[PDB]
Amino acid sequence: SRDRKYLARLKLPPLSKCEALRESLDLGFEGMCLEQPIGKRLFQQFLRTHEQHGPALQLWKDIEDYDTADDALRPQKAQALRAAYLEPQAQLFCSFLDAETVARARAGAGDGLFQPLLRAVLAHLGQAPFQEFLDSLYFLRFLQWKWLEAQPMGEDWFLDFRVLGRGGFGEVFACQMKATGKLYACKKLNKKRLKKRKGYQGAMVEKKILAKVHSRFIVSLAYAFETKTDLCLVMTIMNGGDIRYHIYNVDEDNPGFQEPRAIFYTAQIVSGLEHLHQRNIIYRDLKPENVLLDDDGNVRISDLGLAVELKAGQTKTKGYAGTPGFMAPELLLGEEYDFSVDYFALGVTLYEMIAARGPFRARGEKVENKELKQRVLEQAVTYPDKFSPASKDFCEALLQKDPEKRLGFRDGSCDGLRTHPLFRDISWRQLEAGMLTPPFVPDIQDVGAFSTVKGVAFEKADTEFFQEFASGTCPIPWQEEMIETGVFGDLNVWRP
Amino acid sequence: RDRKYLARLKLPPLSKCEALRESLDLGFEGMCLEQPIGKRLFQQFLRTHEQHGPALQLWKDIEDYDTADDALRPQKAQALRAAYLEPQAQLFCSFLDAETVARAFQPLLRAVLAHLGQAPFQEFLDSLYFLRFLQWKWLEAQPMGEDWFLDFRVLGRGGFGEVFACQMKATGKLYACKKLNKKRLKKRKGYQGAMVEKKILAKVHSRFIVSLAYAFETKTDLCLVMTIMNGGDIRYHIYNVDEDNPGFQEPRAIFYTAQIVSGLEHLHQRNIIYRDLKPENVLLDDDGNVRISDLGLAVELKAGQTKTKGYAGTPGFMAPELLLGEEYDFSVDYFALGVTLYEMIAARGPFRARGEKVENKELKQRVLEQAVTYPDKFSPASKDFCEALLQKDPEKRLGFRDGSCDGLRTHPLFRDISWRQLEAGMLTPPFVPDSRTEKADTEFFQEFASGTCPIPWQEEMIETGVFGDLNVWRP
Ligand SMILES: Nc1ncnc2c1ncn2[C@@H]1O[C@H](COP(=O)(O)OP(=O)(O)OP(=O)(O)O)[C@@H](O)[C@H]1O
Ligand SMILES: Nc1ncnc2c1ncn2[C@@H]1O[C@H](COP(=O)(O)OP(=O)(O)OP(=O)(O)O)[C@@H](O)[C@H]1O
Numbered sequence A: 001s002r003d004r005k006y007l008a009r010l011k012l013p014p015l016s017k018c019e020a021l022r023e024s025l026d027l028g029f030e031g032m033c034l035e036q037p038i039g040k041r042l043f044q045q046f047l048r049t050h051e052q053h054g055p056a057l058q059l060w061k062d063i064e065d066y067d068t069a070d071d072a073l074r075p076q077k078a079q080a081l082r083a084a085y086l087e088p089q090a091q092l093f094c095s096f097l098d099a100e101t102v103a104r105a106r107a108g109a110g111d112g113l114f115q116p117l118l119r120a121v122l123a124h125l126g127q128a129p130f131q132e133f134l135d136s137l138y139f140l141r142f143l144q145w146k147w148l149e150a151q152p153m154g155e156d157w158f159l160d161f162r163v164l165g166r167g168g169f170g171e172v173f174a175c176q177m178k179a180t181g182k183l184y185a186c187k188k189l190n191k192k193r194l195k196k197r198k199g200y201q202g203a204m205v206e207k208k209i210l211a212k213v214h215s216r217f218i219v220s221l222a223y224a225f226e227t228k229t230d231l232c233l234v235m236t237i238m239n240g241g242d243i244r245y246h247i248y249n250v251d252e253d254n255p256g257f258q259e260p261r262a263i264f265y266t267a268q269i270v271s272g273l274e275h276l277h278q279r280n281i282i283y284r285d286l287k288p289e290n291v292l293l294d295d296d297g298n299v300r301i302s303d304l305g306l307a308v309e310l311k312a313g314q315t316k317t318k319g320y321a322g323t324p325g326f327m328a329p330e331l332l333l334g335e336e337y338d339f340s341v342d343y344f345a346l347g348v349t350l351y352e353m354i355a356a357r358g359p360f361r362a363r364g365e366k367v368e369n370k371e372l373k374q375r376v377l378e379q380a381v382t383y384p385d386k387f388s389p390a391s392k393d394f395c396e397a398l399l400q401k402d403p404e405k406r407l408g409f410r411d412g413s414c415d416g417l418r419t420h421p422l423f424r425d426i427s428w429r430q431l432e433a434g435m436l437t438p439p440f441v442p443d444i445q446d447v448g449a450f451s452t453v454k455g456v457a458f459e460k461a462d463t464e465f466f467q468e469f470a471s472g473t474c475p476i477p478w479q480e481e482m483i484e485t486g487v488f489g490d491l492n493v494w495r496p
Numbered sequence B: 001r002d003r004k005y006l007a008r009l010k011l012p013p014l015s016k017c018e019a020l021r022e023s024l025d026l027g028f029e030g031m032c033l034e035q036p037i038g039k040r041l042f043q044q045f046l047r048t049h050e051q052h053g054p055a056l057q058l059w060k061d062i063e064d065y066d067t068a069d070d071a072l073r074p075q076k077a078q079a080l081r082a083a084y085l086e087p088q089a090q091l092f093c094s095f096l097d098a099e100t101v102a103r104a105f106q107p108l109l110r111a112v113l114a115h116l117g118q119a120p121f122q123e124f125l126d127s128l129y130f131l132r133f134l135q136w137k138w139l140e141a142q143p144m145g146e147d148w149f150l151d152f153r154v155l156g157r158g159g160f161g162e163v164f165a166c167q168m169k170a171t172g173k174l175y176a177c178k179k180l181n182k183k184r185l186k187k188r189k190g191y192q193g194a195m196v197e198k199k200i201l202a203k204v205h206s207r208f209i210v211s212l213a214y215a216f217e218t219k220t221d222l223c224l225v226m227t228i229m230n231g232g233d234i235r236y237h238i239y240n241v242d243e244d245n246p247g248f249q250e251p252r253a254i255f256y257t258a259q260i261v262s263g264l265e266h267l268h269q270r271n272i273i274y275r276d277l278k279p280e281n282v283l284l285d286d287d288g289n290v291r292i293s294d295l296g297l298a299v300e301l302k303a304g305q306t307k308t309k310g311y312a313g314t315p316g317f318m319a320p321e322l323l324l325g326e327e328y329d330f331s332v333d334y335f336a337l338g339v340t341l342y343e344m345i346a347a348r349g350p351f352r353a354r355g356e357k358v359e360n361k362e363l364k365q366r367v368l369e370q371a372v373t374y375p376d377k378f379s380p381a382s383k384d385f386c387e388a389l390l391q392k393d394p395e396k397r398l399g400f401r402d403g404s405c406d407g408l409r410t411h412p413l414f415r416d417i418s419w420r421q422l423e424a425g426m427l428t429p430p431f432v433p434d435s436r437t438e439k440a441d442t443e444f445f446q447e448f449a450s451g452t453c454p455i456p457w458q459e460e461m462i463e464t465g466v467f468g469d470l471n472v473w474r475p
């Protein structure tokens, strides 16, 4: 239900304790009032109580409302937006805009109808309105909230209550943040085992990535902390079960997804790959057992241990890594490679979703990595009658052995891929916004211990890696937790 | 109200309040108890912090109890006692002594406020509510002179200028504006008097004295904005509510006397002598309650001074000691009270007949030498009271004792008067008026024109509704 002891420690502090934060912090408008949820709220509360900024705020709200409205209501909403904010005599008309910006808004028509208008509003709001905000109690309230965000919230704050899964380095428990009662998944990594098997680099890249990236198609890191025996990641709980499980379990006699389900999962995965690729990350571990369903039937990618962050200027990488059967020819051959490898994995995943087997080996056949390698390099993929002509087409485009001919990430987006006929019946606008009804709404045993790890002592280098790994609370998710969970509502009161 | 002016009522950016932060009286009593916005913000803050919830609600309930009606008080005592003093009750005040709970209401309040002045206040200072307070104290200190008031009709005439009824343009609250002509003030040397009136009306806060809100200057006048009193003066009422049967009837006279006393008391407790109590100076409001006014001849007694000298006041109301040349204290005001009550009942002074023209020299001689006689209109209790007050020797005169008029309130005249309900403005009055009836110069004017007085302004901001409007967090 949630713990008295810990709730009582979520309390906005006195102002004098926020003097430190005041300076050593990001004053950035985009960072404070656009990307950080509490930051956003407080900024909008500020604009709401200053009458002059009413017309900007409402346009802002009304644009965000329009971006996620249903296709039915849109034309109507698009008109009411133009009628309220873009006619020189309307009550909430927006002086601060160019003629050229107001003109384009009135005349636009398409996928990103009001994104130039939103950019203009945000640019305006980022000027004086923001400067006034900084000079106001609402900004100070933000600091109180940031102060709280930075208070220690380590192992004591989470209650493991059941086993969700098992990794190479530890179990993954369902757990509750005792203060707010929110449910998370807590992936535990045994410190001695990590050392002995030399999995530190892998552990760090997963945390670095889950930390920095915010996408509804990638599991999100909330907290990182350490216990005496383990490193712990607290992340988005996914109770649905991995895709692979559902491919073989939905029908034992007739395994595989009906195509609309496989296209929905494919679209969601793609959108996850695109968020990674836009941030110069190569996943390198896409495959059915790493795609998780949540309580509603929505998927996200997971297991980022094999991912590589490309540096500034770097467009390619090298390194043998991945699961046999999903690694692209480039990778197998030892060549330099980019994001293409992930699209090759995508195709093998789509394949398996449809056909209940890999493109390169029959169901329940043992094939050794050496042989499975030559298959991937030399074998033409055959497609059984199970596949529609659209799904054959798409896989063929992803299974292209030559990366340069492979479909995928061009011009900083996946928009090319999205127009492929397979997605004919998908509102990408809505998929990305999290609105579409998923196709199948869903509805573990504890093994005990991992074997003893004899003869492993820690050096300072090990301890530093652990303190570095245990970097604490991630702002955006914590702030999200505070809001969804009611704690923001309670503590942000002025006079109840 | 006015858009242009209401528009100027806006809370400032926090950076503009760093001036006030370090140059204001941080005292607890002044900030959170006396000042209405500081009080609201303190309470708002406390309500926010649950640990302090018990203390807040107790304070509130003691004040609600103190202003309830006699019929309800017993049940509010029991509920307060059971709700805050039983050890098992949820809202139990841990902080209080065992010695004070056994004793338990005024003492209790002093204990609760004592506690709220320690940690709770210190936490408040380190909170957003104090900064909001500083915001409101910036707006308070902003310039609000001649331009903000629009005078709309004359209410009366004095010796140094007219007294208009005007309205504050931004809040639409009506006041009275006593305007003094600068040139006239110098030529008649009224400087000291206008100054004394202003400093006194600024510093005292009682429902029975007119309250200064603002104080400013035009090119031609020095202007005092104060509590509007549309009921007219008491003299006017003695001789025009009925010209055939002038005078008041006793319970009415007893009513106003009680109010005058309380006002007199308030001045005396703060070492002030009114020195000019008389019916033409007691004014009525629209509800029918009175307030003393025209404090120009008031003297402020310093620390460690029990008496003063100085011939000042209105002939026939100045007491023997003062006329004689002796030293005197608050007792002179009680002598003027006696005269005042007498005139309220008998439609004539005790030292002259109605319409009898007598001059200062002889009027003096009478005040010193004449035995006051009482017609039948005076009941035995009225008689005894006036006799007490008009006793020519100040030693034998009923007056201010042991820092209070508690002694004088005991007199049989006020047997029908519930004191807390009067002193708390609750009692219905006995008559409700009908709505239908050189360089050293320029430095003095600047120094006179001090500006806005906090308490009444804060009060104005709440009653008028501006506080509710501009103190919002998420509407
Ligand atoms: N967010 C989550 N919600 C629910 N279950 C999860 C979550 N993340 C991982 N799991 C489960 O936890 C276990 C570990 O998965 P994960 O892929 O993170 O481990 P891993 O040790 O990195 O695997 P590998 O060694 O193959 O890289 C699996 O049973 C997986 O299904
Ligand atoms: N608050 C008020 N509300 C309404 N009328 C008032 C108020 N104050 C003064 N007046 C009017 O102005 C008249 C004279 O006021 P007041 O006695 O203060 O002037 P003054 O010049 O100080 O008088 P004096 O000449 O005795 O010093 C009063 O009789 C009354 O009619």
Ligand SMILES: [Cl-]
Binding pocket: A135, A136, A137, A138, B011
């Ligand atoms: Cl503010």
Ligand SMILES: [Cl-]
Binding pocket: A250, A256, A257, A258, A261
């Ligand atoms: Cl299906």
Ligand SMILES: [Mg+2]
Binding pocket: A202, A303, A304, A305, A306
């Ligand atoms: Mg891993």
Ligand SMILES: [Mg+2]
Binding pocket: B280, B281, B293, B294
């Ligand atoms: Mg007068």
